[PDB]
C-alpha cells in the first residue's frame, strides 16, 4: 500500500527516480563494501541507528534471493525461461535494491543531512539537458575539515 | 554471512525453530490486520521505534514479491514451471516471512520483553508429551490483569 | 552411598518420583533448546550460578555417552546385543538424565523457589481421581502476571 | 558441543592432555578418598563452592555406570564382548573421570590458585624429553606455613 | 584454530580482501623499499613498536620460503610441479603475505589511523562507478591526517 | 638479509645452538599448550605486549604451512618423496619453529629476564662433560624447592 520506505529519513523514492541505473556499484560490490566496513557492528546486538536496523532487513531479504536463485537453476527443467528470471532480478531488481542500499550505506558515513544535501543538488544535474551540464558530476565528499 | 535479524531485539532464529513452521497466520491475515491498525502511524516521517522500521522493508520486499509474482504470470509462456514457483513462495517464503513479520507486530502491542517472555513458555508447551500438553495452548491476551 | 543431587537446591529424588517417568521431553528436545539459548553464556569463564555448573557435567557425561554409543556400533561384531544396550539408554538412562536435566533449565528461567513451588502442585493434579483431574494440567508460563 | 568443563575454573582440558594415564589413583581409591574426607559436607544441602556442586554430578553420573556395569554382566548372553566394554570404561573412561575427579578433589584442598600454579610447572616437566627431566617430578604440597 | 593478525591493530583480514589482489606491490619491490629504509631500525634491540616487532617475523617466516623454494630444485627436478607450486604461492599465499606486508610498512610512515581511513575511503573509489568518482584515487601525504 | 628475531629481547639465536635440537617438544604438544591458556588472550584486540604480537605471526605463517603441507599430498604423488618434504621440515625448520615457538610461551609465564637466566644456567649444564654432569637438570621455578 501507499507507503514510502524513506519518509522515515526525511527523504523519498519519488526522489530517487533520478538515479541513473548506470550509477550504482555492482550489488556484489556494495555487499562486499558494506559488511567489510561494519560487519562487527552488524552481527552486533545494538540497533545503534535505525539505518543500521533497516539496512540488515534489506540484506537478508536479498540474501534470500541469492539463496533462491540457486534453487531455481537447481530445481528447474526449462533452460529457456530459468535464465530469463535471473535477468529481471539482477537487473530490474538489483536496482530497487542497489538504489536503496547505497543510500543507507554511504549515508551511514556522511550522516543523513550531509547526504540529502547531496541528492538535492545532484537532482538538478541529471535533470539538465546533456548539452548543458559539466561532464563532471557532483560527488560524495566528507565535508571539509573546518568543523 | 552469519547475521541474525533478531540479535538486535535480544533474540535468535536458532530460537523460533521452536514454533511449528505452520503456526504463524497466513500473511493475508497479518497485513489485512497490521496496516489496518498502524497505517497512518507508518505513512509517517517519525520512526517511533526500530520495530516500526523493521517492518517497512519486510512489507515492501514482499510487496516487491507479490509485485513480482503477478508479473511472472504475464511474462512466461510456460504454464508448467510458471505455476510452480509460487509454491516456493506462498509456501516456502511464506514461512521465512510470515514467521518474522508476525513477530514484530506483537511486540508493538505487548512489549519486546513481554514477547521474548512468550516464546520460551510456549516452547515448553509444544515439546511436552501429548498426554500432558493442556489442550489450551498459551496465548497473548493484553493484561486481563487487575486494576487494584 | 546416599547422596541426592538435589538436596543442594532444596529438593529430593524421593520427590520427583511424582512425575510420570514419561513426562520429561526427549533429550533431543532439551538440548536443541537449552544450548540454543544459553550457549555463549556457558562457553563462559563465569559460573553465574551452581545450576549452570550443574548442567555442564550432565551434558558432557551424556555427550560422553552418545560419544560412546556411536563407538559401540563401530567396535562390536554382534548385532544381537549391540543394538540392545541403547534400549537401556535412549530409554533407561534417558529417564535418569532427561529427568534431572529438564529440571535445572527451568529454574534458569523461573526460579529455584518458583520451581519447587511447581512440582508440589502438579503432584496433586496427577494423584487426583481421573474424574477430577482438570484436563488442563499445570504448567510453567512466565508471569502472565499483571503490571499495575 | 564445543564447551570446556573447566573454563569455569580459569582452567582447561586442552590443558590436561598432559596428564599421564599412569598418574592417577585407582578410581576406587579416589572415590573412597574423597567421600571419606568430605562425606558429611556432601550429603549436605549447602553448595558451598561450585566445586562441591560440580563434583557430585561427576560422582553420581559415574555411580550410574558402576550401577550399570552390574546390569551388563547380569543381563547378557555374550561372554566375549560383555567383558570388552568394561575395558573401555574402567580404562578409556576411568581416565576421563579420574582425570577430572582428582582435579576438584585435591584442588578442594589447595584452593584453585595453589593448584593451577601446579599444573602450570608440571606441564613442562612431562613436556620434556626423558633424558632431560629429573626422575623426581613436582608434587602437590600445601604451600609452606609463612602465610 | 581461528584468529586474525589484525584484531590487534584495530583491523581485519576480511577487510583487505576488500582490495584487488592485483593491487599490492610484488614482494620484491616491498622488501627492497622496506629494509632499504629501516634496516638499521630492525637489526636493532628496540621493539620500538609492535609494527616493527610483528613484521620482522613475517620476513623470516617468508625468508624460510625463498630459502625453501630454492631447495625445491636441489632435490626436486621431478614432474611439471617445481613450477606450479611456486605459482599457488605467488598467486595464493604470496598475496596473503604481500597483503599484510605492505600494510605495516605504510603505517610506519603514515600512522595507523592515517592508514585505515585510506582503505576505507579508497576501496570505495574503485568500488564506485566511472564518471561518478574523482579524477584520481586519494593517496598518502604525511602531515594532515586522522579523523 | 641477515637479521635476528631475538635481538629484540636481549637474546640471540646463536644463543640456542646451546640447547640440543632434540629438546623442544613436538609442536603438537606446544601448540596445544598455548591455546589452552591464552585462547581468549589472543583472539583478543589488545596487543597485550610484543611477545603476544609475535606468536600470532608465527602460528599463522605456520598455519599456512600445515594448510599447505596437506596440499603437497593432494595435488602430488610423484616419487616416494611427497613425504620427504617433511624430512627437512620437521628436521631443519620444524626445529626453528619449535625453537622460537617455545621461547615466548615460557617468558610469558616466567619473565623474559627470569628466562635468559635459564639458558645461561643451561648453556653450561650441557657444555659440561657426561660423567661430571649432574643427575637432574635445571627448570622453571615459579618458586618451589626440596
XYZ file of C-alpha atoms in Angstrom, chain C residues 22-107:
86
model
C 7.325 -40.431 30.887
C 6.679 -36.688 31.377
C 10.055 -35.079 30.651
C 10.673 -34.260 26.938
C 13.003 -36.284 24.700
C 16.538 -35.057 25.211
C 16.943 -34.023 21.574
C 14.187 -31.572 22.513
C 16.026 -30.344 25.639
C 19.468 -29.853 24.130
C 18.219 -28.474 20.793
C 16.616 -25.983 23.178
C 18.755 -25.106 26.111
C 22.149 -24.739 24.461
C 20.428 -22.719 21.711
C 19.531 -20.254 24.405
C 22.457 -20.227 26.851
C 25.468 -21.453 24.862
C 27.566 -18.234 24.666
C 26.590 -17.897 28.344
C 28.121 -21.333 29.050
C 31.185 -21.459 26.820
C 31.960 -18.835 29.513
C 34.587 -18.480 32.380
C 31.977 -17.189 34.854
C 29.725 -19.628 36.719
C 26.843 -17.190 37.364
C 25.257 -19.929 39.454
C 25.587 -23.508 40.643
C 22.672 -24.504 38.428
C 24.790 -23.518 35.435
C 27.692 -25.591 36.604
C 25.375 -28.495 37.360
C 24.427 -28.812 33.730
C 27.846 -28.813 32.163
C 28.644 -32.299 33.677
C 25.327 -33.738 32.799
C 25.679 -32.674 29.206
C 29.307 -33.762 28.972
C 28.704 -37.073 30.732
C 25.845 -37.668 28.290
C 27.817 -36.323 25.324
C 30.396 -38.822 26.673
C 27.644 -41.406 26.367
C 26.491 -40.578 22.884
C 30.257 -40.247 22.166
C 30.276 -43.821 23.473
C 27.064 -45.120 21.855
C 28.206 -44.433 18.302
C 31.586 -46.099 19.165
C 29.940 -49.325 20.347
C 28.482 -49.781 16.848
C 31.940 -49.409 15.293
C 33.672 -51.858 17.661
C 31.184 -54.746 18.180
C 30.599 -57.567 15.686
C 27.473 -58.833 17.475
C 24.320 -57.064 16.099
C 22.181 -59.006 18.632
C 23.260 -57.483 21.984
C 24.907 -54.430 20.370
C 21.555 -52.947 19.325
C 20.154 -53.906 22.725
C 22.243 -51.706 25.080
C 20.921 -48.463 23.587
C 17.490 -49.723 24.714
C 18.792 -49.263 28.259
C 19.982 -45.839 27.283
C 17.772 -43.943 24.860
C 15.235 -45.317 27.385
C 16.593 -46.399 30.822
C 19.109 -43.556 31.171
C 17.013 -41.163 29.160
C 14.872 -41.177 32.286
C 17.698 -40.692 34.839
C 19.013 -37.914 32.562
C 16.030 -36.205 30.852
C 14.617 -36.236 34.390
C 17.338 -34.235 36.036
C 18.386 -32.162 33.042
C 14.965 -30.606 32.410
C 14.684 -29.681 35.998
C 17.651 -27.333 36.107
C 16.957 -25.473 32.926
C 13.559 -24.429 34.168
C 14.830 -22.696 37.300
